[PDB]
Amino acid sequence: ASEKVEMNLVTSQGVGQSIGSVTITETDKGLEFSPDLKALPPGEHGFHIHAKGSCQPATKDGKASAAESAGGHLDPQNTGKHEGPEGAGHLGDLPALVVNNDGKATDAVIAPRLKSLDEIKDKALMVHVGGDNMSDQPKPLGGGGERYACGVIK
């Protein structure tokens, strides 16, 4: 089974233009995330599933913050740690999203720990401005920084 999630730009003032979609499919080796995105800054970007199915801004962190409404990283086991797709932390930690020099992301990625679409229903798929070193050191949540794009999983 699979599901298509449309992604949009987010700012501290709301949700912007659509930048494509990501389709998620259940495979023998876990959930596969096959992006078809454009208009993204080239480089590697933090890619995680957040706890709430909302991309709206919220005023937490000395002001308004883009898609802050989605809460933290999905973690139903309350591990409290950020360790990556192959770690034992947040269940929502996905391998990083690599954007090419044309500003597109088209390479599929796998999360072996996720096994069913049922597990991520009504959650938010997020893309960060910063990367992800899959650790809380030396920067929290892998140095992801601000939220750049977001989509809600129906």
Which residue in this structure is represented by tokens 């802050």? 68
Q: Does 45 bind Zn ion (CB under 5 A)?
A: no
Task: Pick between residue 20 and residue 97 the one whose CB is nearest to Cu ion.
Answer: 97
| Residue 93 in marked binding region | yes
Q: Note the Cα 47 to chain centre separation in Å.
A: 4
- Report which residue type is found at 46: G
Q: Does 128 bind Zn ion (CB under 5 A)?
A: no
Choices 14-22, 57-65, 99-107, 125-133; region in contact with Cu ion by CB under 5 A: 125-133
Choices 14-22, 24-32, 96-104, 123-131; region in contact with Cu ion by CB under 5 A: 123-131
Tokens of 39: 């208009």
**Cα–Cα distance measured from residue 8 to residue 61, given in angstroms and rounded to the nearest whole number:** 22
CA dist 96 to 1, 16, 84, 154, Å? 23, 22, 9, 22
Binding residue for Cu ion (CB under 5 A) from 20, 33, 40, 48? 48
Contacts with Cu ion, residue ranges (CB under 5 A): 48, 126
Contacts with Zn ion, residue ranges (CB under 5 A): 73, 82, 90, 93
